[PDB]
């Protein structure tokens, strides 16, 4: 689970915080990236931390 704006960083060669220190993709990556909003399940009103 990541932010809404961080979905561009789950790609080969991407510059980011989670790209460098959390999840790194190789340059020769083959496959598919699936991203979907999870506000209904992965959010809480006081803050889901």
């Amino acid at each position: 689970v990541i932010r809404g704006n961080e979905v561009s960083q789950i790609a080969p060669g991407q510059t980011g915080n989670i790209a460098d220190y959390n999840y790194k993709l190789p340059d020769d990556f083959t496959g598919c990236v699936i991203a979907w909003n999870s506000n209904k399940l992965d959010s809480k009103p006081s803050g889901n931390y």
């Binding site: 809404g4 704006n5 561009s8 510059t15 980011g16 915080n17 460098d20």
Partner: protein, 50 residues
């Protein structure tokens, strides 16, 4: 129509904090990598806000 231009010069820029706090939905670079910005030297830096 009257967009604001600010000149940035004679400073050392840490672009890492721009990433650290950021409501920037779109962060699109054309001629340079975002993570390499800390490793480069520049002149002619301008921020155009509108």
């Amino acid at each position: 129509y009257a967009w604001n231009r600010k000149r940035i010069s004679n400073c050392v820029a840490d672009y890492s904090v721009i990433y650290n706090f950021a409501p920037f939905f779109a962060f699109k670079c054309y001629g340079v990598s975002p993570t390499k910005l800390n490793d480069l030297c520049f002149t002619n830096v301008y921020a155009d806000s509108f």
